Amino acid sequence: SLPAHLQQTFSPEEIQFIVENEPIKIFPRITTRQKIHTRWQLITTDDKALNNMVAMRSTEVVLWIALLLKQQSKCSIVAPQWLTTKELDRKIQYEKTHPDRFSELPWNWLVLARILFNKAKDDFHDPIHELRGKIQDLREIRQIKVLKGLKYLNESHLQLDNLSLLEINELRPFITEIMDKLREIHTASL
Amino acid sequence: TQIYVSPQQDFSDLMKSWKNERCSPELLPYPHQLMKRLLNRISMQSQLIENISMGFLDMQNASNANPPMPNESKLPLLCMETELERLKFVIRSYIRCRLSKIDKFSLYLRQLNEDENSLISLTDLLSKDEIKYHDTHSLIWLKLVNDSILKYMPEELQAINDTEGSVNMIDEPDWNKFVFIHVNGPPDGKWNEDPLLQENEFGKPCYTVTIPDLKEEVELTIGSIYVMRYEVIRDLLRDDKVALI
Amino acid sequence: YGDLGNKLVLEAKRTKQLYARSNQDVNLPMYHEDIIRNILKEVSNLRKNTEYLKEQQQLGMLDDKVAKCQYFVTLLCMERNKRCLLAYQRLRTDILDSMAWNNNGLDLMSSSQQDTNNLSHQEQEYLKEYCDLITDLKSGDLVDIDLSGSLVPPSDVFIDVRVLKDAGEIQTEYGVFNLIKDSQFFVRQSDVERLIQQGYLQKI
Amino acid sequence: MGYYDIDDVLADGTEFPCKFQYDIPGLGYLENNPGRPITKNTKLSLPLWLARILAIVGGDEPVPFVELLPPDMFSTKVMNAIKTDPVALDLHSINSHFFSLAIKWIMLFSEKELANVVSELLLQRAQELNHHASSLSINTNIATSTFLLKLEEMEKEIYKKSHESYKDTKRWMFK
Amino acid sequence: VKIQPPLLRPLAYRVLSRKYGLSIKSDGLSALAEFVGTNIGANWRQGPATIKFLEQFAAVWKQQERGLFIDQSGVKEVIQEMKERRDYFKVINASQQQRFSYNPHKMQFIFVPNKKQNGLGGIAGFLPDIEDKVQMFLTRYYLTNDRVMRNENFQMSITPIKNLLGRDAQNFLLLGLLNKNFKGNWSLEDPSGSVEIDISQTIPTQGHYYVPGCMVLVEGIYYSVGNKFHVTSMTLPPGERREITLETIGNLDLLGIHGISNNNFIARLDKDLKIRLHLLEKELTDHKFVILGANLFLDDLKIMTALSKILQKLNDDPPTLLIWQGSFTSVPVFASMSSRNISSSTQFKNNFDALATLLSRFDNLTENTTMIFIPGPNDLWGSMVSLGASGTLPQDPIPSAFTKKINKVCKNVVWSSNPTRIAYLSQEIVIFRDDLSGRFKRHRLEFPFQKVQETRKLVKTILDQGHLSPFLDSLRPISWDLDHTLTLCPIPSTMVLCDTTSAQFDLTYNGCKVINPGSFIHNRRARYMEYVPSSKKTIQEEI
């Protein structure tokens, strides 16, 4: 896709799509067990989970199907483990005590958060505002660490162990171009 | 590809190929069999959805009868049609990106094709419609530029494929562009039978690469995102060893 | 001498800025082929001068060093003028193709500049042939996919859309949409993208 | 090095001092009276697009027809100023194609003392470029615009791309 | 079999909304339903034939307008399909000629909306507005200057009049309207300014009729003692051929028979031109058209006898186009002050009623040949005010109230203006009936110092100037807006230059061929001339 310079990096909507093409857990409100009825018979996802589904039990579906069922009354999304106060507390403690290493977080960081806060509001066991503020604090400190680490721009390589998709995407056009210019200067000088 | 484990594996391969193509600074070969399977799958899916829609429409409009039960009726069809729409969008974006890249490097590819010594041929890298696109576009652009300017241009330099003098008109791809990579490791579940990877302290198997210009050696461990130039990483990319982000 | 040529190149840059700030194919400027043909006539004068200079050089009266240095200077002049002209034309063709591909290859004479008369006739026939190529391309093995469709990923299935222009009633699959002026529809996303691109709908 | 690149073809038109190291009768016909030949060691301001090649052809003692003098743009004064404080220096006054011209010059002449000073230059300015790009309004003082009007022509695309990327990220995040 | 629309809707919708086409209306669905009804059979199980018929529908409908809606006309495209499973030529007058303006700064012709089509026209819409007479000479000068500048020789440069004020003792080249000022001296007018001329030592280019009101190229020395431009030579601007004139605007549909342009967009076509040229190359001898002399009178017995002798010869072999030109009444028609005898209008009506009787005995010519009538100097509308003298050039056609029997006797009659344009398959023809030799001879400008050369000079001047009436507003008043009809731009292939004061001739020059029919009767002999479209002429007479 040309659109001027949109052929080099990913737009945020593409990032949202690529993140929402991931598995998630679900608690169905209905039952579709076969009589021992139309077959789902999809092509890019296992049907045996959807067809052989009974109410009030745990099963794994893709995120977009979960959202589609959540639009009606046919769903109840289970929040992940890392979206709770007692996990984010130890996480933020880990960033504070370690001033050089990015903490381990899923690469869908901030994105599953945005989607779940926008859509799945009434299923959380914790207040929404507190979790939003703690996520904001996490983003703040990770931004500080990235800004501090950006000062070293070698012409050889660089290492960024635990950056999420959005953080890499919003920084690619600057770091890439600066390092390319440095490489060009060095190569033309030899 | 030679056989399918599951259509979802084909979907994953297509997505990985699209991601690799979008950020790569060089035109990559063409996975014919993957889309050969995918288009046929789309054909059957569309045929079956149309057949079932016709069946319900005829049942509903033959007489009053019983209207279709809302349960297990709307949701499956909605899911199939939206999945088909998303897959079509992904294919469309991939094809458009390849078309843009082929538009950019037309003259360089054409010059490379006529070389007999080059082991790479235009047939492998392109689909037939892309070959026809390149041929027609090059011919029409050459005719336009010849009718506009080159007819008044001196014969000694009327050729647009000149590679002599001060500046060359051939646009080679930039192999030294910096790209963001994620070390995927070996695609196999064992991920330890590869004859290239080595070990460091605390295990952590790594891949060792060297920079001919800078005379260095860089360790690439599994599970870390790096920022490395593209020329030294072509083989690892083509072996599904590392994935660009 | 090639300083005239510079006035072209700088102008082209402004056009690029028009392409950059808008981020939309719209109101492409009106050509500058007058200066181009001025450069063509002066470079024809240069070429004929080179031919006569070669004539005296072959005659034997002219000095070899003078002939060679004048030949190099004139060759550089032709090279730079050609470079400027092709730099102009490549950007023109790029913006032409960019606006041509996205409107389904119809050039939308019903609605973008109206008469597209600011283009040269050669550029106009190039546009027509490119539209022909785009129509031909999706008639092959990709007949089941509309290449000229939207590229925003499909995020929602049911959206609210508001009508912008009045029309009659339009047939759809198993239904009909009567475009009463200034009304709101709660319809499928995959049914009104063509109308939205045409500009007949609003408020996605 | 791109033939169809507009910035490069613009930058090729800059003027550099030169010397006619070798006398050629009948020249200068495009600058003064055609019948008057140009004598030895006569200085002009020739553009780069002919100075690059005319000083390398030689022609023939295969000395070149022209000799290229050290331009005032690359002078001890500018090097001292750039080494003292690069963040507050406005290169836009010296030139608008400074970086591309410097790359061309260092490719023509191998000088291991310009690459490191220029590298430290753009490395130091990149941090403030990022700082200004990350500052999105929610209109501003004189400092940011004063810096933005000091930028080089080649830095504008980096600044714009960073600004658009950050703006898109904020637009997607807050809905 | 009467179908159910719901079970047909998807088949049409898919093809006309996903692969190609868009926005199918309900009437489009009904038209497709009746089309399926006609081609009924093993349908809803027959794939290829229905979809290829739909593709043929697309190939029929995409050329018309833009094809984004289908109204009641669906039956019309169905009939187009049915009929897709001499003609192609038109005759147009100066009233319905398409209007195209001109702009100097962009150097393109610009379409102008027609007041007849978009305006009301209920009371008075034919009246031009005030600025048209201001802009008409500007447009003529702009076209002449562009033609001069496109010449191969001129790439020397001309200078505006106003820039002659500050310099002296230097030679210059200029061009402008050569005419008389208010004082009574000859002057040159330019959009910038005007100066005085000098003629006492002027050497002209022979073969040109130097008449006031024609653009002339002037060479001489300026003097600031007075305001005298001492001329040393005068020459008319040269001409250009049809192909080079066209190629600057591609192949514009000015006289568009295949398609027309409008304010929304501009059109072009050259693919069918060679097809039509080759079509013309065959069966051209059968498609012959014959023209007669001027000033044919429908009152005297001798002219009727000669016409009967011509018609008895022409009945057996009817031509394609028969053109009647000249004044049909030997006396101008005007107000009648006598109530004792036959009124002039009634006599004029009676003059044509006899022609309806004379056409009753020539059913072959009436049945196989079309009629063309062209007004002369003293027909009903002109001589009503000009009383037989010269007047406005865009003359109205013969009024319908005086030709109520010719249109019923003959199946093909057309009344045109004094300048008329017919568009053949690959030919365009202009017919212009008036006197030129005397007009140019009497007003020839004097310079202080075998009959075939006069027509040579006439043709050379009329083709170099590139305008039908190279005279000022004092001599021949012109309608303000219709002047574009008189402009000689994309010059026609053949000119029917009828003149009663010049001998018959068949000259051709600069890619244009000119024919000069004389009077229908002369020295007790009757003469009429037929032109073969293969650049061959014939002249025949019957005593």
PDB file of C-alpha atoms in Angstrom, chain E residues 237-433:
ATOM      1  CA  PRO E 237       0.552  36.707 -41.735  1.00  0.00           C
ATOM      2  CA  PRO E 238       0.984  33.257 -43.295  1.00  0.00           C
ATOM      3  CA  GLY E 239      -1.338  30.269 -42.941  1.00  0.00           C
ATOM      4  CA  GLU E 240      -1.364  26.756 -41.540  1.00  0.00           C
ATOM      5  CA  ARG E 241      -2.746  23.366 -42.528  1.00  0.00           C
ATOM      6  CA  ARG E 242      -5.560  21.402 -40.908  1.00  0.00           C
ATOM      7  CA  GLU E 243      -3.443  18.601 -39.419  1.00  0.00           C
ATOM      8  CA  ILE E 244      -0.976  20.873 -37.606  1.00  0.00           C
ATOM      9  CA  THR E 245      -3.836  23.103 -36.445  1.00  0.00           C
ATOM     10  CA  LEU E 246      -5.689  20.103 -35.014  1.00  0.00           C
ATOM     11  CA  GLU E 247      -2.738  18.336 -33.381  1.00  0.00           C
ATOM     12  CA  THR E 248      -2.220  21.254 -30.976  1.00  0.00           C
ATOM     13  CA  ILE E 249      -5.620  20.402 -29.444  1.00  0.00           C
ATOM     14  CA  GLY E 250      -5.427  16.691 -30.180  1.00  0.00           C
ATOM     15  CA  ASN E 251      -8.499  15.925 -32.296  1.00  0.00           C
ATOM     16  CA  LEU E 252     -11.175  18.089 -30.701  1.00  0.00           C
ATOM     17  CA  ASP E 253     -14.868  17.431 -31.315  1.00  0.00           C
ATOM     18  CA  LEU E 254     -15.700  21.018 -32.265  1.00  0.00           C
ATOM     19  CA  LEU E 255     -17.941  19.782 -35.078  1.00  0.00           C
ATOM     20  CA  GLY E 256     -18.397  16.630 -33.024  1.00  0.00           C
ATOM     21  CA  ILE E 257     -20.572  13.975 -34.642  1.00  0.00           C
ATOM     22  CA  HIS E 258     -19.340  11.017 -32.574  1.00  0.00           C
ATOM     23  CA  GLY E 259     -19.415  12.933 -29.290  1.00  0.00           C
ATOM     24  CA  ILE E 260     -19.760  16.419 -27.862  1.00  0.00           C
ATOM     25  CA  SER E 261     -17.955  18.371 -25.160  1.00  0.00           C
ATOM     26  CA  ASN E 262     -19.497  20.451 -22.387  1.00  0.00           C
ATOM     27  CA  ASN E 263     -18.546  22.477 -19.317  1.00  0.00           C
ATOM     28  CA  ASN E 264     -17.966  19.359 -17.203  1.00  0.00           C
ATOM     29  CA  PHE E 265     -15.270  17.757 -19.366  1.00  0.00           C
ATOM     30  CA  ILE E 266     -13.516  17.760 -22.737  1.00  0.00           C
ATOM     31  CA  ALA E 267     -13.500  14.966 -25.314  1.00  0.00           C
ATOM     32  CA  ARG E 268     -11.293  13.683 -28.125  1.00  0.00           C
ATOM     33  CA  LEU E 269     -11.272  10.951 -30.766  1.00  0.00           C
ATOM     34  CA  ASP E 270      -8.890   9.710 -33.463  1.00  0.00           C
ATOM     35  CA  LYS E 271      -9.435   5.927 -33.555  1.00  0.00           C
ATOM     36  CA  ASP E 272     -12.519   6.088 -35.797  1.00  0.00           C
ATOM     37  CA  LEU E 273     -11.071   8.710 -38.159  1.00  0.00           C
ATOM     38  CA  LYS E 274      -9.156   6.202 -40.286  1.00  0.00           C
ATOM     39  CA  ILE E 275     -12.145   3.833 -40.234  1.00  0.00           C
ATOM     40  CA  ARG E 276     -14.355   6.634 -41.564  1.00  0.00           C
ATOM     41  CA  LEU E 277     -11.678   7.613 -44.098  1.00  0.00           C
ATOM     42  CA  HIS E 278     -11.601   4.064 -45.462  1.00  0.00           C
ATOM     43  CA  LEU E 279     -15.409   3.943 -45.445  1.00  0.00           C
ATOM     44  CA  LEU E 280     -15.397   7.147 -47.501  1.00  0.00           C
ATOM     45  CA  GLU E 281     -12.851   5.621 -49.901  1.00  0.00           C
ATOM     46  CA  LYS E 282     -15.550   3.174 -51.058  1.00  0.00           C
ATOM     47  CA  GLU E 283     -18.997   3.995 -52.459  1.00  0.00           C
ATOM     48  CA  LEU E 284     -18.050   7.655 -52.812  1.00  0.00           C
ATOM     49  CA  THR E 285     -19.018   7.899 -56.488  1.00  0.00           C
ATOM     50  CA  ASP E 286     -22.572   6.823 -55.632  1.00  0.00           C
ATOM     51  CA  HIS E 287     -22.709   9.483 -52.888  1.00  0.00           C
ATOM     52  CA  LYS E 288     -22.541  12.515 -55.159  1.00  0.00           C
ATOM     53  CA  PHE E 289     -23.811  15.992 -54.315  1.00  0.00           C
ATOM     54  CA  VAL E 290     -24.564  18.718 -56.859  1.00  0.00           C
ATOM     55  CA  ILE E 291     -24.762  22.488 -56.389  1.00  0.00           C
ATOM     56  CA  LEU E 292     -26.303  25.124 -58.646  1.00  0.00           C
ATOM     57  CA  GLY E 293     -25.621  28.781 -59.325  1.00  0.00           C
ATOM     58  CA  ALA E 294     -26.620  31.773 -57.252  1.00  0.00           C
ATOM     59  CA  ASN E 295     -29.502  34.274 -57.610  1.00  0.00           C
ATOM     60  CA  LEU E 296     -32.025  31.828 -59.085  1.00  0.00           C
ATOM     61  CA  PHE E 297     -35.338  33.641 -59.509  1.00  0.00           C
ATOM     62  CA  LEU E 298     -38.738  31.977 -59.043  1.00  0.00           C
ATOM     63  CA  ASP E 299     -40.707  34.633 -60.939  1.00  0.00           C
ATOM     64  CA  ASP E 300     -39.522  34.675 -64.562  1.00  0.00           C
ATOM     65  CA  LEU E 301     -40.511  31.964 -67.027  1.00  0.00           C
ATOM     66  CA  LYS E 302     -37.034  31.418 -68.508  1.00  0.00           C
ATOM     67  CA  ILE E 303     -35.510  30.373 -65.179  1.00  0.00           C
ATOM     68  CA  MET E 304     -38.396  27.961 -64.571  1.00  0.00           C
ATOM     69  CA  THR E 305     -37.905  26.482 -68.051  1.00  0.00           C
ATOM     70  CA  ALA E 306     -34.175  26.024 -67.441  1.00  0.00           C
ATOM     71  CA  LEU E 307     -34.873  24.456 -64.041  1.00  0.00           C
ATOM     72  CA  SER E 308     -37.372  22.050 -65.613  1.00  0.00           C
ATOM     73  CA  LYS E 309     -34.765  21.109 -68.225  1.00  0.00           C
ATOM     74  CA  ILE E 310     -32.259  20.456 -65.432  1.00  0.00           C
ATOM     75  CA  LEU E 311     -34.744  18.444 -63.357  1.00  0.00           C
ATOM     76  CA  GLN E 312     -35.817  16.199 -66.238  1.00  0.00           C
ATOM     77  CA  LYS E 313     -32.130  15.315 -66.647  1.00  0.00           C
ATOM     78  CA  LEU E 314     -31.543  14.871 -62.902  1.00  0.00           C
ATOM     79  CA  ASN E 315     -34.667  12.800 -62.161  1.00  0.00           C
ATOM     80  CA  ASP E 316     -33.323   9.535 -63.595  1.00  0.00           C
ATOM     81  CA  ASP E 317     -30.114   9.648 -61.498  1.00  0.00           C
ATOM     82  CA  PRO E 318     -30.894  11.377 -58.188  1.00  0.00           C
ATOM     83  CA  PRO E 319     -27.851  12.680 -56.296  1.00  0.00           C
ATOM     84  CA  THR E 320     -27.413  12.581 -52.529  1.00  0.00           C
ATOM     85  CA  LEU E 321     -27.372  16.282 -51.576  1.00  0.00           C
ATOM     86  CA  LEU E 322     -28.862  18.992 -53.796  1.00  0.00           C
ATOM     87  CA  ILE E 323     -28.023  22.529 -52.658  1.00  0.00           C
ATOM     88  CA  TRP E 324     -30.167  25.474 -53.756  1.00  0.00           C
ATOM     89  CA  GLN E 325     -28.305  28.747 -53.217  1.00  0.00           C
ATOM     90  CA  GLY E 326     -28.911  32.385 -54.060  1.00  0.00           C
ATOM     91  CA  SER E 327     -31.758  34.849 -53.806  1.00  0.00           C
ATOM     92  CA  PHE E 328     -35.103  33.311 -54.768  1.00  0.00           C
ATOM     93  CA  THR E 329     -36.815  36.644 -55.529  1.00  0.00           C
ATOM     94  CA  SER E 330     -35.444  39.240 -57.939  1.00  0.00           C
ATOM     95  CA  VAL E 331     -36.974  42.159 -55.982  1.00  0.00           C
ATOM     96  CA  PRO E 332     -36.397  42.754 -52.246  1.00  0.00           C
ATOM     97  CA  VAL E 333     -39.458  42.396 -50.022  1.00  0.00           C
ATOM     98  CA  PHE E 334     -40.460  45.297 -47.779  1.00  0.00           C
ATOM     99  CA  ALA E 335     -43.490  47.291 -46.650  1.00  0.00           C
ATOM    100  CA  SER E 336     -46.317  47.574 -49.177  1.00  0.00           C
ATOM    101  CA  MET E 337     -48.121  50.916 -49.444  1.00  0.00           C
ATOM    102  CA  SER E 338     -50.748  49.736 -51.963  1.00  0.00           C
ATOM    103  CA  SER E 339     -53.859  47.766 -50.998  1.00  0.00           C
ATOM    104  CA  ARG E 340     -55.079  47.391 -54.601  1.00  0.00           C
ATOM    105  CA  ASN E 341     -52.628  44.724 -55.833  1.00  0.00           C
ATOM    106  CA  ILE E 342     -50.887  41.616 -54.506  1.00  0.00           C
ATOM    107  CA  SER E 343     -48.804  42.199 -51.384  1.00  0.00           C
ATOM    108  CA  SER E 344     -45.084  41.448 -51.388  1.00  0.00           C
ATOM    109  CA  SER E 345     -45.339  38.803 -48.654  1.00  0.00           C
ATOM    110  CA  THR E 346     -48.190  37.027 -50.448  1.00  0.00           C
ATOM    111  CA  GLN E 347     -46.226  37.094 -53.710  1.00  0.00           C
ATOM    112  CA  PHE E 348     -43.186  35.673 -51.896  1.00  0.00           C
ATOM    113  CA  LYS E 349     -45.377  32.873 -50.544  1.00  0.00           C
ATOM    114  CA  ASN E 350     -46.757  32.278 -54.047  1.00  0.00           C
ATOM    115  CA  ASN E 351     -43.250  31.977 -55.516  1.00  0.00           C
ATOM    116  CA  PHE E 352     -42.634  28.781 -53.524  1.00  0.00           C
ATOM    117  CA  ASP E 353     -46.062  27.212 -54.115  1.00  0.00           C
ATOM    118  CA  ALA E 354     -45.165  26.742 -57.790  1.00  0.00           C
ATOM    119  CA  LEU E 355     -42.051  24.797 -56.771  1.00  0.00           C
ATOM    120  CA  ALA E 356     -44.264  22.323 -54.906  1.00  0.00           C
ATOM    121  CA  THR E 357     -46.153  21.755 -58.165  1.00  0.00           C
ATOM    122  CA  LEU E 358     -42.958  21.410 -60.219  1.00  0.00           C
ATOM    123  CA  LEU E 359     -41.612  18.827 -57.752  1.00  0.00           C
ATOM    124  CA  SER E 360     -44.707  16.645 -58.253  1.00  0.00           C
ATOM    125  CA  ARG E 361     -43.471  15.347 -61.635  1.00  0.00           C
ATOM    126  CA  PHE E 362     -39.985  14.341 -60.397  1.00  0.00           C
ATOM    127  CA  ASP E 363     -40.840  11.750 -57.753  1.00  0.00           C
ATOM    128  CA  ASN E 364     -37.442  10.049 -58.103  1.00  0.00           C
ATOM    129  CA  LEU E 365     -35.487  13.191 -57.190  1.00  0.00           C
ATOM    130  CA  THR E 366     -37.932  14.025 -54.392  1.00  0.00           C
ATOM    131  CA  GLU E 367     -37.793  10.484 -52.989  1.00  0.00           C
ATOM    132  CA  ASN E 368     -34.034   9.879 -53.218  1.00  0.00           C
ATOM    133  CA  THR E 369     -32.424  13.324 -52.759  1.00  0.00           C
ATOM    134  CA  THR E 370     -32.426  15.817 -49.889  1.00  0.00           C
ATOM    135  CA  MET E 371     -32.873  19.550 -50.468  1.00  0.00           C
ATOM    136  CA  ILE E 372     -30.701  22.374 -49.114  1.00  0.00           C
ATOM    137  CA  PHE E 373     -31.734  26.037 -49.312  1.00  0.00           C
ATOM    138  CA  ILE E 374     -29.440  28.976 -48.545  1.00  0.00           C
ATOM    139  CA  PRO E 375     -30.626  32.595 -48.182  1.00  0.00           C
ATOM    140  CA  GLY E 376     -29.232  35.336 -50.376  1.00  0.00           C
ATOM    141  CA  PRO E 377     -28.720  39.081 -49.961  1.00  0.00           C
ATOM    142  CA  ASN E 378     -32.380  40.133 -50.311  1.00  0.00           C
ATOM    143  CA  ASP E 379     -34.545  37.394 -48.801  1.00  0.00           C
ATOM    144  CA  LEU E 380     -37.451  37.993 -46.429  1.00  0.00           C
ATOM    145  CA  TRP E 381     -35.578  38.839 -43.230  1.00  0.00           C
ATOM    146  CA  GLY E 382     -32.595  40.812 -44.531  1.00  0.00           C
ATOM    147  CA  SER E 383     -34.238  42.950 -47.209  1.00  0.00           C
ATOM    148  CA  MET E 384     -36.957  43.678 -44.638  1.00  0.00           C
ATOM    149  CA  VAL E 385     -34.608  46.286 -43.120  1.00  0.00           C
ATOM    150  CA  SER E 386     -31.531  46.429 -45.365  1.00  0.00           C
ATOM    151  CA  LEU E 387     -33.784  46.776 -48.450  1.00  0.00           C
ATOM    152  CA  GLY E 388     -31.444  44.666 -50.572  1.00  0.00           C
ATOM    153  CA  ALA E 389     -28.185  46.108 -49.233  1.00  0.00           C
ATOM    154  CA  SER E 390     -25.599  44.283 -47.145  1.00  0.00           C
ATOM    155  CA  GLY E 391     -26.335  43.737 -43.472  1.00  0.00           C
ATOM    156  CA  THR E 392     -25.871  41.315 -40.603  1.00  0.00           C
ATOM    157  CA  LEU E 393     -23.935  38.204 -41.614  1.00  0.00           C
ATOM    158  CA  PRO E 394     -25.554  35.449 -39.469  1.00  0.00           C
ATOM    159  CA  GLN E 395     -28.750  35.489 -41.511  1.00  0.00           C
ATOM    160  CA  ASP E 396     -31.818  33.676 -40.232  1.00  0.00           C
ATOM    161  CA  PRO E 397     -33.169  30.763 -42.300  1.00  0.00           C
ATOM    162  CA  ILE E 398     -36.195  31.096 -44.556  1.00  0.00           C
ATOM    163  CA  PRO E 399     -39.255  31.522 -42.291  1.00  0.00           C
ATOM    164  CA  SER E 400     -41.436  28.460 -41.813  1.00  0.00           C
ATOM    165  CA  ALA E 401     -44.614  30.461 -42.510  1.00  0.00           C
ATOM    166  CA  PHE E 402     -43.596  30.757 -46.189  1.00  0.00           C
ATOM    167  CA  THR E 403     -42.549  27.134 -46.863  1.00  0.00           C
ATOM    168  CA  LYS E 404     -45.582  25.149 -45.705  1.00  0.00           C
ATOM    169  CA  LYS E 405     -45.791  23.034 -48.890  1.00  0.00           C
ATOM    170  CA  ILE E 406     -42.153  22.196 -49.674  1.00  0.00           C
ATOM    171  CA  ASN E 407     -41.761  20.303 -46.389  1.00  0.00           C
ATOM    172  CA  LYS E 408     -44.767  18.115 -47.265  1.00  0.00           C
ATOM    173  CA  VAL E 409     -43.956  17.537 -50.948  1.00  0.00           C
ATOM    174  CA  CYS E 410     -40.349  16.548 -50.215  1.00  0.00           C
ATOM    175  CA  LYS E 411     -39.299  14.180 -47.437  1.00  0.00           C
ATOM    176  CA  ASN E 412     -35.914  15.858 -46.818  1.00  0.00           C
ATOM    177  CA  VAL E 413     -35.573  19.656 -46.913  1.00  0.00           C
ATOM    178  CA  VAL E 414     -33.219  21.733 -44.754  1.00  0.00           C
ATOM    179  CA  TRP E 415     -33.014  25.523 -44.468  1.00  0.00           C
ATOM    180  CA  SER E 416     -29.691  26.869 -43.190  1.00  0.00           C
ATOM    181  CA  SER E 417     -28.090  30.228 -42.440  1.00  0.00           C
ATOM    182  CA  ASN E 418     -25.852  32.140 -44.842  1.00  0.00           C
ATOM    183  CA  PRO E 419     -22.757  30.482 -43.304  1.00  0.00           C
ATOM    184  CA  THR E 420     -23.519  26.771 -42.907  1.00  0.00           C
ATOM    185  CA  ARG E 421     -21.440  23.765 -41.873  1.00  0.00           C
ATOM    186  CA  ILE E 422     -21.979  20.159 -42.953  1.00  0.00           C
ATOM    187  CA  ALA E 423     -19.955  17.317 -41.430  1.00  0.00           C
ATOM    188  CA  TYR E 424     -19.393  14.299 -43.678  1.00  0.00           C
ATOM    189  CA  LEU E 425     -17.805  11.044 -42.500  1.00  0.00           C
ATOM    190  CA  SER E 426     -14.304  12.527 -42.879  1.00  0.00           C
ATOM    191  CA  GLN E 427     -15.107  15.859 -44.566  1.00  0.00           C
ATOM    192  CA  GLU E 428     -16.405  19.226 -43.372  1.00  0.00           C
ATOM    193  CA  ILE E 429     -17.873  21.757 -45.801  1.00  0.00           C
ATOM    194  CA  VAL E 430     -18.573  25.481 -45.423  1.00  0.00           C
ATOM    195  CA  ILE E 431     -20.844  27.394 -47.809  1.00  0.00           C
ATOM    196  CA  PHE E 432     -20.756  31.199 -47.823  1.00  0.00           C
ATOM    197  CA  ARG E 433     -22.979  33.119 -50.254  1.00  0.00           C
TER     198      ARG E 433
END
